[PDB]
Symmetry: D2
Subunit: 264 residues, 4 copies
Amino acid sequence: APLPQLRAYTVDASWLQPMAPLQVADHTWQIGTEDLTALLVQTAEGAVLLDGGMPQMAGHLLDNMKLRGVAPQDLRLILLSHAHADHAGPVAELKRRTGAHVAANAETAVLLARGGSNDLHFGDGITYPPASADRIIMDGEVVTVGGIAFTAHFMPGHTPGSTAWTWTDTRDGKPVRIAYADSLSAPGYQLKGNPRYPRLIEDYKRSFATVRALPCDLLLTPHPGASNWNYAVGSKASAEALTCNAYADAAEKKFDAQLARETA
Amino acid sequence: APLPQLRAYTVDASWLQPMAPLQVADHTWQIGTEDLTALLVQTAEGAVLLDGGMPQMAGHLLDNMKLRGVAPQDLRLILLSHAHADHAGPVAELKRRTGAHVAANAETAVLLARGGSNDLHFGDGITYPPASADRIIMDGEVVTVGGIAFTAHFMPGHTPGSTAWTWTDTRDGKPVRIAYADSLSAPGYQLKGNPRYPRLIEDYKRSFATVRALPCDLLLTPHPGASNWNYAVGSKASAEALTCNAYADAAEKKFDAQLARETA
Amino acid sequence: APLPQLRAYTVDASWLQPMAPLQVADHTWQIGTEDLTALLVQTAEGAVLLDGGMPQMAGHLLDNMKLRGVAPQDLRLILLSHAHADHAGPVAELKRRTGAHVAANAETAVLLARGGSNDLHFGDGITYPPASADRIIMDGEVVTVGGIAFTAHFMPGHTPGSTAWTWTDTRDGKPVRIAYADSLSAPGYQLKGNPRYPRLIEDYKRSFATVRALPCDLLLTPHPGASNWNYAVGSKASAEALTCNAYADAAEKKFDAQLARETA
Amino acid sequence: APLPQLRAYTVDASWLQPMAPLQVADHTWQIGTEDLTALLVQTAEGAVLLDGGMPQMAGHLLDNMKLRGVAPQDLRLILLSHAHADHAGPVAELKRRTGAHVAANAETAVLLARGGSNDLHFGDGITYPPASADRIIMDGEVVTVGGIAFTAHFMPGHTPGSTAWTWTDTRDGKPVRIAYADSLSAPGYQLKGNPRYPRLIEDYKRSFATVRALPCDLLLTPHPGASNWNYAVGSKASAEALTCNAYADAAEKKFDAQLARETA
Ligand SMILES: [Zn+2]
Ligand SMILES: [Zn+2]
Ligand SMILES: [Zn+2]
Ligand SMILES: [Zn+2]
Ligand SMILES: [Zn+2]
Ligand SMILES: [Zn+2]
Ligand SMILES: [Zn+2]
Ligand SMILES: [Zn+2]
C-alpha cells in the first residue's frame, strides 16, 4: 500500500471556457473566461489587469490583450482580489512575459509568495506558481495609472488579504462608479474556534459592512455568479446584476446559516 | 472547447512505497521510500536530513525519525541534492513542524524559493510548495553538525544547483567515506543550443569529472537505481552498489549517446 | 557640490548600555540593555526571545543567554513587537548563529523582509539587515513553546504589524499575567491625510482600546520608559510600572494633542 | 562603556560627484557620477540601465534619464555587475519609481535580496535597501531589449555573482563591440583558505581568462579608474582606456602579488 499520488486542482469546464473581450465601461474590459473574471483597464499611459484566473489562462489573457491593441509591455500593473489559484494563477507567468508590477496588501503578498501553499483552510491542495509583490498597498490607498485612480478597500474573510477595488470610469462621457468586490464565501471553512484564524467571524462581519458602503454604480466579482453577471449573453451581461447592498446581504445570510449549522 | 485541466505530478508506485529505517553506517540511516532516498544522520547535538522525497512524504519521514528516537525539534539541518519535486517536496512542511534550517547553494535556493516553478526544462509541470533557504553554502564549504563535517561539492547539470554531499562516518569504529552524489541524468533535456542553459554541456562534463574524484568508500544517489542500491533487500542493499568511477562513467556514456542522437 | 554621504542610525548611549539578566518572573528574563527590552523565556523544551534591540546587540544577547544556561541551539523561537531597527536589528544574525525560527504577522514579515527599508514614515533612514519570517501568525493566534502559551494581539499604529504578546508565567508558584505591549507612539508621523497610511488614525484608536483590555498583571514595553520600568535599579525595576489602562490612556492623550497641533 | 554606534558607508567625494550624460556609443550613455559608472542604453522599445551606483543616486539617475527623453516608465530592465552598495544601491528605489524589472544571476539575486548583508568578506558593513530579482539569467544567456542583445558572462571573484555584460552598438553606423566587465579586485579579501569561499582563488583565475576572451572593442568597468576611463574630460574620456587583455593582465598581477604577501 503506497502513499497516494498528488491530486491536481480541477474546476468546472465553464471556468476555463475562453471568451472574447466583453466591454464593461469605456475603459473597462472583461478578458477572462465565461465563469472567471479578469478585468483589463486601458489608459493613456498603460494597462491595468485585475486578477488573472486559473494558471493555464496566461496565454488567453495575452491574446485578448493583443485583441485590444495592448502589447505585453503595455501592461503596467496587476491588481488582485485574493491570492488563490483560480484568481492569481497566471500572475507569475504574466510578470515574466509582460514586464508588469504587482500591487497587493501584505497578507495577499505573503500568500502570493508561497503560491497559495499552507492555506489557512485548504492546506497544500491548491498550489500555483509563486509570485512576488512589488508594491505593498494599505487600506484606503489610492493607486493611479494613466489618470484612473484605484482605491483599495480591505475586506478580510475568504482570505486575510481579500481586497475590493473601486475606480470611476465613464460610459459615453458619463461617470460610472465601479466596485470589484472580492468573494464573501466560506466554502468548507471552519468558522467557530478556528486556531489558524481566531477572529475570522469578526472579520467577515466587518467585511459585510464594508461591501455595503462601497462607492458603486456597477458591481463585479471574481466569480460572476455571485453578482448575477452572465458573461455569455454579450451586452446583456449586466442585466440582472446585483447591487453592493444585495450582494453583502445575501452573502451574510448564507454566512449566518453556515454558522448556525456548524454549531450543531 | 475549454482550456485543459491542470495535470498533477504522478510517479511510479515504488517511489511512494514506505519502508522502515535501513542502516547505512553507524550514524547514517535511510528513512525514505523503496525508490527515493532520504538520509538521516544522528549526531550528539541533533539530526541532519539529506533530501526528503515527494511532497506527500513529510508524515512518513517524521514517523521514521520518531522510530530512531529523534523528535521533530531534534532535526537541525536539511541538506538537498537538487530542488525538484521528488527530492525537496516536503521541505516546506518539514520546516514548519520540526523547526529546522535549510542549507543550500544560491541556485538551489532560488529554485526552492519558487517551488520548482519555471524550471529550465520542465516549466511549471512539477510545482511543489515553496521553501526558503536559511544559509547559502558555497562550493567546498564545510557544514558541521554535532562533530560530523559535511562538505559540499557543486556538480551542475540536472539542475544548476545540483550538489554532492560528502561526510565521513564509521562502521563499528572504522571510518567509511560516504558520498551522496546527485543525479547525472538529463531526461528530455535539450542539450545543444539551449537558450535557458547555454553552457549546459560544459557543466555536465566538469560534473562527471567532479563525481569521479569524490572522497568515497560508499556511494548513494537520490534515486537508488542509479547507484545499484536495492533498498528492499535489507542488509544486502549495498551488495552491488557502484563506485563513483563507475557511476560517472556510465552516466557520461548515456549523456554522449543522448547528445549524438539529439544532433541527428 | 557632491551628493551627501549616507547617515548611520545613532541612538542614545543608554540604549546600547549592556546589563546583566534581570529577572521579571519565574521563567521571564530581561537580557537587553538598560533602555531596550529583550525578553527571554526559559521553558523545558527550549527558549523564546521577544525582540532583540539594536543590530549590534546580537553578541550581547548570546552572552546573557549563555549566562542563563541557554545554548544557541536552545533558542527555538523569536517573537517581535514591530520590525524596526531598534527592536528587530539582530534578528538576521540571531537566526544564523542559533538555528531559531521567527514568528510574526504578515505586515511585520514584509517589513522584516526588506530590513525596514521603504518605511511608511522613515523611508530608508533606518535600514537593518533583512530577515525572513518562518511562520505567519494571525490576530489572537496561540503559540505554545514548552507548555507556555503566547497569545498575539494585533495593535497597528507605530507599524502596521505592531503586535502585543501576552503569556502567563508564575512567581513562586503563583500565576502572573504578563503583557508585552508594543509602542503606542507616533514620532514625527503625519497622522491626518497620510497617503501611505490612510486609516492610520482609526488604527491607533482601536489599538488604544486593545491595550486597555489586555489580560495583564505586569506590563512591559519595548522601551522601558514608556511603561515606567527602570532596568537599572535591579529588583525595584517594576516599582512604579504602569498598568495597561494607564499606558494606553497616557498614550492616547499624547496622540490627541499631536493630532490637534498637526491640524494647526 | 556602551556598545559602539552604527557606522555608515562613506565613500570619496568624487564617487558622488554628479555629471551630465556623457555619450559612449550611438545608444550608450553614461549617467552616473564622475567615479561611478551607470550605463543607459536607449532602444526603440525602452531603456536598459546597467548598475546604478550609490543608494543616494536614484534621484540623479532619473534626472539624467529625463534629460535623454526617457520617462520612468520607459526604463524596462536593470542589469547589474555585482550586488554591492556602490553599484546596486538605488535598485530598490528605481524599481518603485520606474516600473522596471531586474535581471541577475542566482548569486547576485540572493545578495540583492538581503541588501548586501552577510557579505562573504564585509559582513554587515555595507548594507543597502534590499531588492528582488525578477528574472534569473544563466552564463551565456542572451537578453534582448528593443533589438539590442545583451550577453552575460559569469566572472566570479569580487562577488560570486559578478557578471560581465557584452552588447554590440554602433558609432555613426559602424558596429562597436562593448564589454562591461565587473571589478577584478579583492580589497582586504582573505584569498587562501577562506571558509566562506573555499574555491575563491580558482574562481578568480578562470575569471581572468574569461575577461581576456571577451568580444570587446571598447571596455568599461563599474569603477572607471580600473579601465583608465576619465569621465570628467568629456569626449576624450576613452582616450587612454585599456583593452580587455590589459585589464585582466594588470588585475592578475595585483592578485598574484596580494596572494604572495598574504602567504607571508
Ligand atoms: Zn478563493
Ligand atoms: Zn475563487
Ligand atoms: Zn530531478
Ligand atoms: Zn529525481
Ligand atoms: Zn519603532
Ligand atoms: Zn523603538
Ligand atoms: Zn564591490
Ligand atoms: Zn565597487
